[PDB]
Write a structure and sequence with these properties.
binds 2-acetamido-2-deoxy-beta-D-glucopyranose; ML_dom; 0% helix; 130 residues; six-stranded mixed beta sheet; Immunoglobulin-like; cholesterol metabolism; mainly beta
Length: 130
Amino acid sequence: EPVKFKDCGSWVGVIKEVNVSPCPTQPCKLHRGQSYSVNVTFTSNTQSQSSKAVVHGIVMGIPVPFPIPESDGCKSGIRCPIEKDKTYNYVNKLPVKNEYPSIKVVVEWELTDDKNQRFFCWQIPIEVEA
Ligand SMILES: *[C@@H]1O[C@H](CO)[C@@H](O)[C@H](O)[C@H]1NC(C)=O
């Protein structure tokens, strides 16, 4: 489902939609042991040979790197080279491990280009539980 998000600095890209599934109500509640589909539709404002995704889980106010299956954007539904003014659907999974504590977390997800400029940067509040 499309979710409400806060843009944290998209600069060389424009976010059209952030879709997390399954997420029938918000803030999305994520169950420990389950993985969620993330589909970010954005339009590029530049070109780039590569793209890298970095995710952080802001817990108790502290941003901590968040493990994801693939950090190479070009292996995440984006056919690189990324070209200017083209629309892409970045797709990945947000794994909620069984060991993760049951608390509120703000997930920050960004995709950067060859110069580390952000195609997109967004944050969404989530609730982790059993
Ligand atoms: C991602 O979202 C776009 C736009 O809604 C859709 O066209 C595309 O099929 C989706 N990709 C997935 C979920 O595999």
